[PDB]
mmCIF file of N, CA, C and O and ligand atoms in Angstrom:
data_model
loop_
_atom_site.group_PDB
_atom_site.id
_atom_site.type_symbol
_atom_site.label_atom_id
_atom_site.label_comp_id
_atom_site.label_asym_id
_atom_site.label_seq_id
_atom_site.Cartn_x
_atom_site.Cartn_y
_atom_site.Cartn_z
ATOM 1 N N UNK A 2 0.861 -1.217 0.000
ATOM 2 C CA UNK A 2 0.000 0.000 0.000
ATOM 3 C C UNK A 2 0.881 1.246 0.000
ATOM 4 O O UNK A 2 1.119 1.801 -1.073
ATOM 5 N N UNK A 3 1.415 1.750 1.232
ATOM 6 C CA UNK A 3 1.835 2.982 1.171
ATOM 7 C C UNK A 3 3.535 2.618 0.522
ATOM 8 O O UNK A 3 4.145 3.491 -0.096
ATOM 9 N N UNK A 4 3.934 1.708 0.687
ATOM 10 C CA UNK A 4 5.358 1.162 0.478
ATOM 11 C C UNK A 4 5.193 -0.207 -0.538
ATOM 12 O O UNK A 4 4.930 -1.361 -0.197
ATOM 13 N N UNK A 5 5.488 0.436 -2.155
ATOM 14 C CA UNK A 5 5.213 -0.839 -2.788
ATOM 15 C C UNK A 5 6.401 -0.886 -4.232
ATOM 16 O O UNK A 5 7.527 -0.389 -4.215
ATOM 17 N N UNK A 6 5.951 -1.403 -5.054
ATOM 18 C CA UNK A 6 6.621 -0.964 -6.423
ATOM 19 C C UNK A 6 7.891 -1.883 -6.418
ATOM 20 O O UNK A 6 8.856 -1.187 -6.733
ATOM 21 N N UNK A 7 8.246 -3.138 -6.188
ATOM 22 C CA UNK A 7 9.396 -3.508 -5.628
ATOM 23 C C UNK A 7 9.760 -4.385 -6.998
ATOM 24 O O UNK A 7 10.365 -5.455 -6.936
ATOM 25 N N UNK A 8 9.353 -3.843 -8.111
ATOM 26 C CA UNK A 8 9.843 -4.654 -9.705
ATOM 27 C C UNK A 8 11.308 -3.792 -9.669
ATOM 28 O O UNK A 8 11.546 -2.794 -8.989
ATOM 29 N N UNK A 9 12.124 -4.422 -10.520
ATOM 30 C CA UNK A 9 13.867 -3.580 -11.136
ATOM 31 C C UNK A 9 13.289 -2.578 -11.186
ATOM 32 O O UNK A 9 13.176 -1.734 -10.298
ATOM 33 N N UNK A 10 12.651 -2.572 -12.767
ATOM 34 C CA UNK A 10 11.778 -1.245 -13.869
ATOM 35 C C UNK A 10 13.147 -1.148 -14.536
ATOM 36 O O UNK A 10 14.047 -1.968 -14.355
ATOM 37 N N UNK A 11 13.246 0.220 -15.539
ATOM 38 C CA UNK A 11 14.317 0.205 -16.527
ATOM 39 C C UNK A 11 15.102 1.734 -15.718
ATOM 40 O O UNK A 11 16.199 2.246 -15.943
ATOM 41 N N UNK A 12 14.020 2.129 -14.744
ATOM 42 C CA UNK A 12 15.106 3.072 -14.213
ATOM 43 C C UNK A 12 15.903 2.551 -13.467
ATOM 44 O O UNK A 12 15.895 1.477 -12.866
ATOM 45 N N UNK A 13 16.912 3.726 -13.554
ATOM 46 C CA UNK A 13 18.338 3.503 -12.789
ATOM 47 C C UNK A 13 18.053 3.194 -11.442
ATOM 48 O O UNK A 13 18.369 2.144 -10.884
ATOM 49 N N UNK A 14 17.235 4.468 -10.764
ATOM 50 C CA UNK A 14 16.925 4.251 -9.832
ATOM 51 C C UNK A 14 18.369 4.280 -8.322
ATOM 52 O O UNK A 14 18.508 3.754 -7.217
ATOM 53 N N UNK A 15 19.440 5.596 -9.554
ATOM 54 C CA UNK A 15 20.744 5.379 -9.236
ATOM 55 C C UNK A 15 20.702 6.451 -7.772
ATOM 56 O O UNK A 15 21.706 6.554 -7.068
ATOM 57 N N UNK A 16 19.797 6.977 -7.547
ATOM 58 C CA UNK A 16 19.709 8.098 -6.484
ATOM 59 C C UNK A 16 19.062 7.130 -5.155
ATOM 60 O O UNK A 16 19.117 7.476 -3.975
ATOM 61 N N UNK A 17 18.692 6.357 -5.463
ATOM 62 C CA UNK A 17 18.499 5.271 -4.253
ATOM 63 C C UNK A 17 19.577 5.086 -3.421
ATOM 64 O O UNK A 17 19.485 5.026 -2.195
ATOM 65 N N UNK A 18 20.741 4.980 -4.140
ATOM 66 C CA UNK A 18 21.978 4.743 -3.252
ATOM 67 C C UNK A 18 22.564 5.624 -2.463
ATOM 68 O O UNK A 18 23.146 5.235 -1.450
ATOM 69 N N UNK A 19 22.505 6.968 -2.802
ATOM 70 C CA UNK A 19 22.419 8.585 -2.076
ATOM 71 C C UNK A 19 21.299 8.792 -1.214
ATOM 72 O O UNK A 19 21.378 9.833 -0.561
ATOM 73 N N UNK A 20 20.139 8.002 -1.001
ATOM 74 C CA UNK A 20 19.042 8.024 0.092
ATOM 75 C C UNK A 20 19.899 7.304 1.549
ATOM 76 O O UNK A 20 19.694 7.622 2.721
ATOM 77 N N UNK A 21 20.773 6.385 1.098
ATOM 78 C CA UNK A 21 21.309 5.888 2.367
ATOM 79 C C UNK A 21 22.707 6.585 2.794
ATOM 80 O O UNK A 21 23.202 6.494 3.917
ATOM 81 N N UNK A 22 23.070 7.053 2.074
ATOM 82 C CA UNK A 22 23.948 8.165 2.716
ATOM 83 C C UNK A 22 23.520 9.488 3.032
ATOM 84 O O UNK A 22 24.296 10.402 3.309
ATOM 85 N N UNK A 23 22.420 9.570 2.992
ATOM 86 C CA UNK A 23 21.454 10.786 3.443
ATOM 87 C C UNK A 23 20.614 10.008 4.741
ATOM 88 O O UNK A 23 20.819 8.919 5.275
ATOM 89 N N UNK A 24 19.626 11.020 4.987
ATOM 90 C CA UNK A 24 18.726 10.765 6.328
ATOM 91 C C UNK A 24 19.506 10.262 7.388
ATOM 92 O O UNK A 24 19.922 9.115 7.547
ATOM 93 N N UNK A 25 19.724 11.746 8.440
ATOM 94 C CA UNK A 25 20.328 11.283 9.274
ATOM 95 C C UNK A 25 19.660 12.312 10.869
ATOM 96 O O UNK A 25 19.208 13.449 10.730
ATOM 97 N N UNK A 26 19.722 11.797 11.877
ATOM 98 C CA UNK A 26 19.060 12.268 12.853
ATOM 99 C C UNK A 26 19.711 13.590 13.168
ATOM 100 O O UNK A 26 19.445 14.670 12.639
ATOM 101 N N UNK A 27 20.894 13.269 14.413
ATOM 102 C CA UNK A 27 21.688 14.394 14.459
ATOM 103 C C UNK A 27 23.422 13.860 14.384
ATOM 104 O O UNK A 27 23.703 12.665 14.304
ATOM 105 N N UNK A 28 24.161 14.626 14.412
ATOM 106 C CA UNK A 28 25.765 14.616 14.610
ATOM 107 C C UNK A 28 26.296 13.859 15.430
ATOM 108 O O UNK A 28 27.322 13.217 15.208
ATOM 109 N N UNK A 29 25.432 13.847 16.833
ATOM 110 C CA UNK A 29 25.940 13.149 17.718
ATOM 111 C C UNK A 29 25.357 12.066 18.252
ATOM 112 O O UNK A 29 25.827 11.467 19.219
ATOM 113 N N UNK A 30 24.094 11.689 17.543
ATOM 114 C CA UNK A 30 23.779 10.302 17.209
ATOM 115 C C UNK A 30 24.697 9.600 16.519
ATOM 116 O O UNK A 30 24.891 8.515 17.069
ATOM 117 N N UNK A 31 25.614 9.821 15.146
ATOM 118 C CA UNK A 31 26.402 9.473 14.092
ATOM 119 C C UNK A 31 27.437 9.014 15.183
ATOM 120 O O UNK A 31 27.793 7.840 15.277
ATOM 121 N N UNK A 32 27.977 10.201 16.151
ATOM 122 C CA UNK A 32 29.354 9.735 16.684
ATOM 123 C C UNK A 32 29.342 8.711 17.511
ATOM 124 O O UNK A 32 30.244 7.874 17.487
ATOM 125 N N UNK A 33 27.995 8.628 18.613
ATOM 126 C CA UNK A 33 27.730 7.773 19.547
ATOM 127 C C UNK A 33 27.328 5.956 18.635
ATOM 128 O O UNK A 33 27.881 4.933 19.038
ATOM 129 N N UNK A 34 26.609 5.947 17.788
ATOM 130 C CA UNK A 34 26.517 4.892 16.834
ATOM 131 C C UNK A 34 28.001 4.294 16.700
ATOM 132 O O UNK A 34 28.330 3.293 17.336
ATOM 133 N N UNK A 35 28.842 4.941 15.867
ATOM 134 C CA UNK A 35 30.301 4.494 15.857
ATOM 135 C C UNK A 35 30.499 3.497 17.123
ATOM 136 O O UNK A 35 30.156 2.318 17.035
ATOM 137 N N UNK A 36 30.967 3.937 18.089
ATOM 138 C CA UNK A 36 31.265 3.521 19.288
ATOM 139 C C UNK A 36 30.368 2.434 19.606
ATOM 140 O O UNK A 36 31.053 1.566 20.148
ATOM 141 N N UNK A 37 29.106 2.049 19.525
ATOM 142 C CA UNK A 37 28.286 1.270 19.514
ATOM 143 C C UNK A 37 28.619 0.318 18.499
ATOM 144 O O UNK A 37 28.462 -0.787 19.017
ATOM 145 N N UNK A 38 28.909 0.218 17.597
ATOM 146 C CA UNK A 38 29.577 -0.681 16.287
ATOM 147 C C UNK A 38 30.349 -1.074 16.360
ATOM 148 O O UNK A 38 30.645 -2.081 15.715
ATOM 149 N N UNK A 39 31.260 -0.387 17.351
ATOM 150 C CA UNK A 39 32.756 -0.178 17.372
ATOM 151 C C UNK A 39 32.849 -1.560 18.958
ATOM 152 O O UNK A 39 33.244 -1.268 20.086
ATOM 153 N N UNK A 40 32.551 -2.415 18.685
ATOM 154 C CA UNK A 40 32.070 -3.528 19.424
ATOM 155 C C UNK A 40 33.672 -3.737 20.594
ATOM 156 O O UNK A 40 34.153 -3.631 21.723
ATOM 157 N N UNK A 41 33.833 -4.041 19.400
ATOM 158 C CA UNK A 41 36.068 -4.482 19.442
ATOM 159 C C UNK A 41 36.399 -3.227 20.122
ATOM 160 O O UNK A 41 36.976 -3.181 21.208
ATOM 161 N N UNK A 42 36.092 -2.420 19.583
ATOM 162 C CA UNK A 42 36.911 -0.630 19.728
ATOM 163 C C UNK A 42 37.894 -0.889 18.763
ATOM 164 O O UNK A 42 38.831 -0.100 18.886
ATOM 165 N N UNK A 43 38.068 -1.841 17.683
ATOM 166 C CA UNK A 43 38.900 -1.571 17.007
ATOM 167 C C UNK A 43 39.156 -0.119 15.873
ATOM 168 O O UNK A 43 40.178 0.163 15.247
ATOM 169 N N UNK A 44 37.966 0.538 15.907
ATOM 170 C CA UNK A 44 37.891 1.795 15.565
ATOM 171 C C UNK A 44 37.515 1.145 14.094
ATOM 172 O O UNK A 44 37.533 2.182 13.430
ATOM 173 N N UNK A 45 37.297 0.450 13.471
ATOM 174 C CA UNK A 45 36.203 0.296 12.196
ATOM 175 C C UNK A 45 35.117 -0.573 12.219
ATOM 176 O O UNK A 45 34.797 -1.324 13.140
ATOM 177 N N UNK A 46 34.480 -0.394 10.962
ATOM 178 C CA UNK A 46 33.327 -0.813 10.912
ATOM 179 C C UNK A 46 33.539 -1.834 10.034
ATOM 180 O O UNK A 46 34.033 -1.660 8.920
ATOM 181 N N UNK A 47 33.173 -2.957 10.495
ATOM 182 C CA UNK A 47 33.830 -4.179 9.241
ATOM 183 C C UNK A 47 31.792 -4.697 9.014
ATOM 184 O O UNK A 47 30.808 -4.246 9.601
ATOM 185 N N UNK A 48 31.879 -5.551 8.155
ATOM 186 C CA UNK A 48 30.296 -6.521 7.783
ATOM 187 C C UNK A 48 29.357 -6.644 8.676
ATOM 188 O O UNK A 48 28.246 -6.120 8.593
ATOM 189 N N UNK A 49 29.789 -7.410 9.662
ATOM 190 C CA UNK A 49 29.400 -7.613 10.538
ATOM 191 C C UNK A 49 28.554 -6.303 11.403
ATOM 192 O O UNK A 49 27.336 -6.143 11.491
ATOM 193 N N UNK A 50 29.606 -5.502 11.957
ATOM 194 C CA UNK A 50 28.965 -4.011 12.200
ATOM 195 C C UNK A 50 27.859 -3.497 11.629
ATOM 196 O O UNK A 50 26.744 -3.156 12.024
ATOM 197 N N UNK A 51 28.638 -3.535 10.245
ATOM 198 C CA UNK A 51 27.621 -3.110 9.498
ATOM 199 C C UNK A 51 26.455 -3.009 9.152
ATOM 200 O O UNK A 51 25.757 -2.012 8.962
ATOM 201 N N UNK A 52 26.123 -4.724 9.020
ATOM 202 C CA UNK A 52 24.772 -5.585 8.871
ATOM 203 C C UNK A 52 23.907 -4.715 10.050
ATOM 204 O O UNK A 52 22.911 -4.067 9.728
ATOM 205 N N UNK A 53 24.484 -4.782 11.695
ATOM 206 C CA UNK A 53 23.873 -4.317 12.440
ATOM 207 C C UNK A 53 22.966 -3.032 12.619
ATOM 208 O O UNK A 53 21.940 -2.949 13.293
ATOM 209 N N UNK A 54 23.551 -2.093 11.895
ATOM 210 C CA UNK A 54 22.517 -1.088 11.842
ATOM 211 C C UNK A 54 21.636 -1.007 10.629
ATOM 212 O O UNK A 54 20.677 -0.257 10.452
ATOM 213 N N UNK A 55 22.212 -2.056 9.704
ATOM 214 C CA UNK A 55 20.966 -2.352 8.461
ATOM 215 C C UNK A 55 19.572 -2.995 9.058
ATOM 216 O O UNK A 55 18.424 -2.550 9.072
ATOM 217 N N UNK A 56 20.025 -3.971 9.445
ATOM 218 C CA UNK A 56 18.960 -4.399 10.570
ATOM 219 C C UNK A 56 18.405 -4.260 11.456
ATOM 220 O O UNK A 56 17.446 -4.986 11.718
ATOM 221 N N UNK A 57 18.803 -3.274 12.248
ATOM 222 C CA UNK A 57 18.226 -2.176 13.401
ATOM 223 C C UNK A 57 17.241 -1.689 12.202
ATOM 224 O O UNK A 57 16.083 -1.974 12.506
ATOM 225 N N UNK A 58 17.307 -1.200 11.239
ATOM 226 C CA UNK A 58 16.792 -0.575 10.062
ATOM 227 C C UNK A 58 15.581 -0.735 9.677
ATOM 228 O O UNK A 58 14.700 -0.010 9.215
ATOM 229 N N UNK A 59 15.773 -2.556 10.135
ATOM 230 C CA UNK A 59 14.768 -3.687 9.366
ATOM 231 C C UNK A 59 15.242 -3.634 8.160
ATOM 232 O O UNK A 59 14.455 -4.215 7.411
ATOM 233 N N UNK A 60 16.287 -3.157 7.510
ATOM 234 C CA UNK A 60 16.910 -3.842 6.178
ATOM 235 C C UNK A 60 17.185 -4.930 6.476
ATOM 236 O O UNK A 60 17.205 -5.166 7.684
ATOM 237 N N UNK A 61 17.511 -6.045 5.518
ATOM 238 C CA UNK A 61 18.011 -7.424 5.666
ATOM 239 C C UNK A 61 18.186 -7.739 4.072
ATOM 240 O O UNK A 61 17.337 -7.823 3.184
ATOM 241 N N UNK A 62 20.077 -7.927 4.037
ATOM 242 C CA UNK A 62 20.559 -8.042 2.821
ATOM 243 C C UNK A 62 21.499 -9.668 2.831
ATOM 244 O O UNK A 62 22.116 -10.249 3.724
ATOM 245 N N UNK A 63 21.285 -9.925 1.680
ATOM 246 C CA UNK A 63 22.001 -11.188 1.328
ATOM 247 C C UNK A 63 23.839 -10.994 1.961
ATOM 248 O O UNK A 63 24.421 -9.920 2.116
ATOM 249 N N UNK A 64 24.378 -12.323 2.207
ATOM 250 C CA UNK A 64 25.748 -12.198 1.704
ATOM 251 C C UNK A 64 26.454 -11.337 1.385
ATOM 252 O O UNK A 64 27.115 -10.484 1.977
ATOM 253 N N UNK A 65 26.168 -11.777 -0.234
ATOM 254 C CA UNK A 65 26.838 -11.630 -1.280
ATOM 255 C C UNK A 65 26.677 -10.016 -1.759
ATOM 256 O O UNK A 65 27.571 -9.267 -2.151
ATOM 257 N N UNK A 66 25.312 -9.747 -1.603
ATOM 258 C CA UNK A 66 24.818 -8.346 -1.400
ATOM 259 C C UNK A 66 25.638 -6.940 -0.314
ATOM 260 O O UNK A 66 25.899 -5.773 -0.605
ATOM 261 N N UNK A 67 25.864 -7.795 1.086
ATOM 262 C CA UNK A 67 26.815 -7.042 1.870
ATOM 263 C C UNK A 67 27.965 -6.883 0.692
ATOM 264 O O UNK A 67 28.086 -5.923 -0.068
ATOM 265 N N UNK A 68 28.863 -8.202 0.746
ATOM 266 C CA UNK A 68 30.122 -7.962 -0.169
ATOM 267 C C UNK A 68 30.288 -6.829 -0.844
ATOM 268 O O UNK A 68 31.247 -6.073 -0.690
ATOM 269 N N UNK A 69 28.708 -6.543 -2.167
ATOM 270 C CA UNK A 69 29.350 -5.703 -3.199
ATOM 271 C C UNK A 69 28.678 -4.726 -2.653
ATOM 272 O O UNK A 69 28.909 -3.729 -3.337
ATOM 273 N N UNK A 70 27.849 -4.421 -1.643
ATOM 274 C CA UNK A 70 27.695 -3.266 -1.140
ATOM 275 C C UNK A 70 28.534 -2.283 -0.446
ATOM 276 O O UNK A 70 28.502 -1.059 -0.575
ATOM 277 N N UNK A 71 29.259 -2.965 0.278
ATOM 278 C CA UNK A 71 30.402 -2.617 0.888
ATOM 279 C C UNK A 71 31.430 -2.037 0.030
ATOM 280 O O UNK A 71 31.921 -0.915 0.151
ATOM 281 N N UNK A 72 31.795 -3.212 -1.145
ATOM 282 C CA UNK A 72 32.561 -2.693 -2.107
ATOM 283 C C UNK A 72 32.044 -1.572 -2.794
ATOM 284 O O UNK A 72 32.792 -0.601 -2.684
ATOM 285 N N UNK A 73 31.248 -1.409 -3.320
ATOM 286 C CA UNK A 73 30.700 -0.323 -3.791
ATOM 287 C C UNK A 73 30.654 0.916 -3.165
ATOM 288 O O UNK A 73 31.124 1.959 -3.621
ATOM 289 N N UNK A 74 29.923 0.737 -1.832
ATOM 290 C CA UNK A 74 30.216 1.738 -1.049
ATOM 291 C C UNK A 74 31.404 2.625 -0.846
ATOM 292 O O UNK A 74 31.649 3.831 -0.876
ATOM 293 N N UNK A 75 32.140 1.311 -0.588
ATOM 294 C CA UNK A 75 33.550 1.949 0.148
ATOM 295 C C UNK A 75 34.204 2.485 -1.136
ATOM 296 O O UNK A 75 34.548 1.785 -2.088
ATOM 297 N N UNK A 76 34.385 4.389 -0.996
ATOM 298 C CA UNK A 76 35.524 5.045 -1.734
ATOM 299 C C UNK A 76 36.716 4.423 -2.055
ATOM 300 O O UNK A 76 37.055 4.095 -3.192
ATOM 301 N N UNK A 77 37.620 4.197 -0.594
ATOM 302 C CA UNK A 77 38.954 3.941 -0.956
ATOM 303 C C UNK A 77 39.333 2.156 -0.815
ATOM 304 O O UNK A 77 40.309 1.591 -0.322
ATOM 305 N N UNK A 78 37.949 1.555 -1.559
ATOM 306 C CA UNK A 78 37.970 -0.108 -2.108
ATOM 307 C C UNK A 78 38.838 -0.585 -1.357
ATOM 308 O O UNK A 78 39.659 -1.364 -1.842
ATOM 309 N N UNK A 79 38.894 -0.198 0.219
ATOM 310 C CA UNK A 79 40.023 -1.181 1.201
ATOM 311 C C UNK A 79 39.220 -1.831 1.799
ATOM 312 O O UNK A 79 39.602 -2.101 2.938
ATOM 313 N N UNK A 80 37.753 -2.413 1.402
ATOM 314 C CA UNK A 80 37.422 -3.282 2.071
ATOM 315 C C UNK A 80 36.878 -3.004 3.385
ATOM 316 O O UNK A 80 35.995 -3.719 3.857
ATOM 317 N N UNK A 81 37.299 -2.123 3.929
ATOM 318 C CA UNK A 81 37.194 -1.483 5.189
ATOM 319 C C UNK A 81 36.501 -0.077 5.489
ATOM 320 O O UNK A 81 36.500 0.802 4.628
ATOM 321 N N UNK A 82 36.082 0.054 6.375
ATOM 322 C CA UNK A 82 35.360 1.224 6.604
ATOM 323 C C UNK A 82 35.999 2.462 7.749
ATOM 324 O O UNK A 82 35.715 2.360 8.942
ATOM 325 N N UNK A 83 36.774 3.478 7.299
ATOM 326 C CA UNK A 83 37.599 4.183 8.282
ATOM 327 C C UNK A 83 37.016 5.025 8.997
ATOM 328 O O UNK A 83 36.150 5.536 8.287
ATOM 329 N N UNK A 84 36.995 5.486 10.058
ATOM 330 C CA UNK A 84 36.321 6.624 10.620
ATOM 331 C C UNK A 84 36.204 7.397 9.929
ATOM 332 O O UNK A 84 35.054 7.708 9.620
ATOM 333 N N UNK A 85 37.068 7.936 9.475
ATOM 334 C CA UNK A 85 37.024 9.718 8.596
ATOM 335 C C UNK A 85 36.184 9.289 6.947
ATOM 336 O O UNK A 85 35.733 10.024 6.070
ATOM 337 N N UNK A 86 36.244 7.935 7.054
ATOM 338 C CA UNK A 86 35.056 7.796 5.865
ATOM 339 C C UNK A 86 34.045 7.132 6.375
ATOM 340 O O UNK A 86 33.106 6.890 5.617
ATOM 341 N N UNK A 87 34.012 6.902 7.079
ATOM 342 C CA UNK A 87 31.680 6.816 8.067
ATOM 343 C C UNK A 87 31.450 7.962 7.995
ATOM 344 O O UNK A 87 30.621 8.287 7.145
ATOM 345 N N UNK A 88 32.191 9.245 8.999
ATOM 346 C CA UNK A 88 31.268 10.185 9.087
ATOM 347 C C UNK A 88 31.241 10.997 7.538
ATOM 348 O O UNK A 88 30.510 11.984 7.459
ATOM 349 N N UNK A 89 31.814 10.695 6.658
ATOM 350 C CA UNK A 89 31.938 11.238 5.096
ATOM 351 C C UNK A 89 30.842 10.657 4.425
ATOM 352 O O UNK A 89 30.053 11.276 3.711
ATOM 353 N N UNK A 90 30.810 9.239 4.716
ATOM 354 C CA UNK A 90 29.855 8.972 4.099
ATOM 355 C C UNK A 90 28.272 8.434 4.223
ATOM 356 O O UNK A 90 27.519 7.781 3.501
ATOM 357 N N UNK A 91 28.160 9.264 5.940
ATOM 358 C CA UNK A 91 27.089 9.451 6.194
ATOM 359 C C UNK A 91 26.576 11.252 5.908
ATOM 360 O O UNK A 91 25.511 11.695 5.478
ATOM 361 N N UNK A 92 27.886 11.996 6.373
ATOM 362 C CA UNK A 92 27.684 13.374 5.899
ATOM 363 C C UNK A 92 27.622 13.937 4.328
ATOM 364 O O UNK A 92 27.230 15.028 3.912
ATOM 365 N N UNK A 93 28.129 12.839 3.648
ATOM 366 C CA UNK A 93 28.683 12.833 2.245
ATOM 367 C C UNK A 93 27.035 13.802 1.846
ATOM 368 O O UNK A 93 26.046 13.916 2.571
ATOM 369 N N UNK A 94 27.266 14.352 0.489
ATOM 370 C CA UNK A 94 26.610 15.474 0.195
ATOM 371 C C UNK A 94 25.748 16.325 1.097
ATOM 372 O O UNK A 94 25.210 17.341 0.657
HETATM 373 CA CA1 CA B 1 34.412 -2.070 15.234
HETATM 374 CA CA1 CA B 2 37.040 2.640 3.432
#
């Protein structure tokens, strides 16, 4: 009903991916989250982490889906997620 439409279609539909680096509460929700992720304190955010606030979300993504999401996501393709690129690419545009 209010949430539907869930075919490919032929659009890109490429601004979908800029909705999740957008919508964000405040600043210091972002910083306190980290630390909450930050399970280890190893100071990144690896899959695992990750998944976690997708699913807080009620997102729920495949595998293989994390993999190239991640990859995709991640700017500097290290696989990894650095501090100074979370809050970039939650602040990103
Ligand atoms: Ca961590
Ligand atoms: Ca990275």
């Amino acid at each position: 009903g209010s949430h539907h439409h869930h075919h490919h279609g032929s659009s890109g539909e490429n601004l979908y991916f800029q909705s999740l680096m957008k919508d964000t509460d405040s600043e210091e929700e972002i910083r306190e989250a980290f630390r909450v992720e930050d399970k280890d304190g190893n100071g990144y955010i690896s899959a695992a982490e990750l998944r976690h606030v997708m699913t807080n979300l009620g997102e729920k993504l495949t595998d293989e889906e994390v993999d190239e999401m991640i990859r995709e996501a991640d700017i500097d393709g290290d696989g990894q997620v650095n501090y100074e690129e979370f809050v970039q690419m939650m602040t990103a545009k």
